[PDB]
Structure 1
Amino acid sequence: GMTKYKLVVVGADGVGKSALTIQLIQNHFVDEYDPTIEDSYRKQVVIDGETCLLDILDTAGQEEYSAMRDQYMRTGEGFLCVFAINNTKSFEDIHHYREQIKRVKDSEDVPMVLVGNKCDLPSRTVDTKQAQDLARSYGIPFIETSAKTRQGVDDAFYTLVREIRKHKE
């Protein structure tokens, strides 16, 4: 038991939190998935020749008390902050998610990746540069993804893992 990585997926409702995690774990794209469902997913992967286990909480951000939600927030090593490129509101909402993570971790150095999802859609409302600058503002990687095509799906989770390794040394 050498390396396990605890990852948390956060972001506005309907940006593709669920779709992204399932696409990663089950290698399929989900049409519909209950927006109120918050669950943890485990899968063994090799990343850069190093076999490790990913332990990934897909957040739904409901109100009811969860002991598991709390555990992941406190012990979680890295966070995906997801918006959608066709959803200007979800992009504007990123800052709320960043600040909560800062508070939870009580630090400015928290492994994170900015992810722009639904990049397979022509109706973009959020420019590469827009997202690029925010991620630059935060000093974090920005990756464009599609849960429907798998574009960037591996790079999003793997980049985050790599961010976590840099935090280890």
Structure 2
Amino acid sequence: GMTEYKLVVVGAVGVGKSALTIQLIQNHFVDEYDPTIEDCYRKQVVIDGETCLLDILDTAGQEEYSAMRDQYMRTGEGFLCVFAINNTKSFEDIHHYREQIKRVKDSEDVPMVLVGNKSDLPSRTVDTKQAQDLARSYGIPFIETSAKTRQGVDDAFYTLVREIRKH
């Protein structure tokens, strides 16, 4: 029976969650993609010699702490916590996203990967060392990515699948 992996891509609006997901599924960089549209994607892949189905939720829209929104995010098995390396607030917001995940999953060891997106941009404001240290404190991997060039994209999602398998 082919295993399905439910991944949820989270992070501040504009960090590149939609661009990262479309790059993984369709292998192209979409410049303009409505910031309010939330959608699901599927991709069958082989990871470490095992065929599996990725079911990815590309989150969007306003902040909502309803019983229903909490139960929907509770269905996620692994979370890609994305920030943009050229926006310090998106990086500081990561503390909030992790605490919300920890709260709804009622667990301190939820499969998760920290992702620094837009590594193609020269206007960096978040130091790789600062991100690596935050990831160490949480005990999770840190993958730098660029949805524009495809740097680290397969690596970000496949790393999250491996975190779920071990868990």
In 2, the alpha carbon distance for the partners of 1:143 and 1:132 equals: 9
Report the 3-state secondary structure (helix = DSSP H, G, I; strand = E; otherwise coil) of the residue aligned with 2:148.
coil
Report the 3-state secondary structure (helix = DSSP H, G, I; strand = E; otherwise coil) of the residue aligned with 1:133.
helix
In 2, the alpha carbon distance for the partners of 1:65 and 1:91 equals: 21
Displacement of 1:6 in angstroms is 0.4
In 2, the alpha carbon distance for the partners of 1:66 and 1:19 equals: 27
Matched-pair identity in %: 98
Taking a change above 3 Å as real, the CA distance of residues 96 and 84 of structure 1, as seen in their structure-2 partners, is: same
Counterpart for residue 22 of structure 1: 22
In 1, the alpha carbon distance for the partners of 2:39 and 2:66 equals: 11
Contact kept? 1:57, 1:72, Cα under 8 Å: no
Displacement of 1:48 in angstroms is 1.6
How many residue pairs are counted as aligned between the two chains?
Answer: 167
Displacement of 1:62 in angstroms is 2.3
Report the 3-state secondary structure (helix = DSSP H, G, I; strand = E; otherwise coil) of the residue aligned with 2:27.
coil
Contact kept? 1:36, 1:61, Cα under 8 Å: yes
Contact kept? 2:117, 2:145, Cα under 8 Å: yes
Taking a change above 3 Å as real, the CA distance of residues 69 and 25 of structure 1, as seen in their structure-2 partners, is: farther
Contact kept? 1:115, 1:143, Cα under 8 Å: yes
Taking a change above 3 Å as real, the CA distance of residues 73 and 132 of structure 1, as seen in their structure-2 partners, is: same
Counterpart for residue 57 of structure 2: 57
In 2, the alpha carbon distance for the partners of 1:66 and 1:7 equals: 20
Displacement of 1:66 in angstroms is 9.3
Displacement of 1:130 in angstroms is 0.5
In 1, the alpha carbon distance for the partners of 2:62 and 2:73 equals: 14
Contact kept? 1:45, 1:53, Cα under 8 Å: yes
The more displaced of 54-63 and 111-120 is 54-63
Displacement of 1:76 in angstroms is 1.0
Displacement of 1:67 in angstroms is 9.9
Q: Which runs of 5+ in 1 are unaligned?
A: none
Displacement of 1:71 in angstroms is 5.3
